[PDB]
Design a protein around this ligand. Structure first.
Ligand SMILES: *[C@@H]1O[C@H](CO)[C@@H](O)[C@H](O)[C@H]1NC(C)=O
Ligand SMILES: [Zn+2]
Ligand SMILES: [Zn+2]
Ligand SMILES: [Zn+2]
Ligand SMILES: [Zn+2]
Ligand SMILES: [Zn+2]
Ligand SMILES: [Zn+2]
Ligand SMILES: [Zn+2]
Ligand SMILES: [Zn+2]
Ligand SMILES: [Zn+2]
Length: 233
């Protein structure tokens, strides 16, 4: 259980607007989330998530999210990105952030009159995959391998970020990354912990595009997707 927190995602905004009672509940399951991190099709979840708790499809705007960029950045800017993990839902695993550089695809997610189809959700997800923002693009950022993966496996890569191991760390799982205090970010079920990294934005401009967060669970066959409306100018 978790969702993207900074920049403020559609999911965060949905919660803050009083629509989403459980922002961390937006889950793609059952899927094979491990060890091949892109194997699972995203279905109705799409790159922005679908929350079955309150039946919210975040792949289109509403009066409460998706109309405007929440934050504007510069081409090639190194930025903080943060997600929120629920205290009772720290499944470990790997996570990443992505920007689709095909505006015509992204535009289908920026119209409150229009709900992308499953085909369009998967087309966008593929575009997002191609626009992954690697951990290793940030000078000085230590980009480790997962303690739940071995060399040569499909999960053995440090373009994606990893949570800590469970048994193999004194700071276990995703919460151990920041080792933050409980309620450092909002979750409804048992209180949240921040999970914080940096990414380097592409040299790609848009007045309104998306950054899609994807977390592939290790302990469970589940993926958590959110997206944030941003500008790069
Ligand atoms: C987007 O905004 C900039 C100002 O930051 C403007 O000059 C540019 O032409 C706008 N783009 C489009 C496609 O209209
Ligand atoms: Zn969970
Ligand atoms: Zn709240
Ligand atoms: Zn994918
Ligand atoms: Zn794959
Ligand atoms: Zn700028
Ligand atoms: Zn506790
Ligand atoms: Zn296009
Ligand atoms: Zn394995
Ligand atoms: Zn483990």
């Amino acid at each position: 259980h978790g969702y993207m927190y900074i920049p403020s995602s559609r999911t965060r905004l949905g919660h803050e607007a009083g629509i989403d009672s459980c922002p961390e509940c937006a889950i793609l399951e059952p899927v094979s989330s491990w060890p091949d991190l892109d194997a699972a099709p995203v279905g109705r979840s799409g790159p922005c998530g679908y929350n079955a708790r309150d039946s919210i499809d975040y792949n289109q705007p509403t009066t409460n999210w998706g109309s405007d960029a929440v934050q504007s950045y510069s081409p090639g800017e190194e930025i903080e990105v943060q997600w929120c993990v629920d205290h009772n839902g720290d499944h470990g695993g790997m996570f990443t952030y992505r920007i689709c550089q095909d505006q015509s695809i992204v535009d289908k997610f920026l119209d409150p009159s229009y709900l992308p189809t499953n085909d369009e959700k998967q087309a966008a997800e593929d575009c997002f995959d191609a626009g992954l923002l690697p951990c290793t693009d940030v000078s000085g950022q230590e980009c480790g391998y997962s303690a739940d993966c071995t060399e040569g496996e499909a999960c053995w890569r440090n373009d994606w970020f990893t949570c800590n191991g469970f048994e193999a760390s004194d700071r276990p799982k995703c919460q151990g990354v920041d080792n933050a205090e409980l309620n450092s970010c909002y979750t409804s079920i048992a209180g949240g912990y921040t999970v914080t990294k940096k990414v380097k934005l592409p040299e790609y401009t848009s007045n309104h595009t998306l950054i899609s967060f994807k977390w592939n669970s290790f302990q469970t066959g589940q993926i958590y997707l959110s997206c944030a409306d941003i500008a790069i100018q």
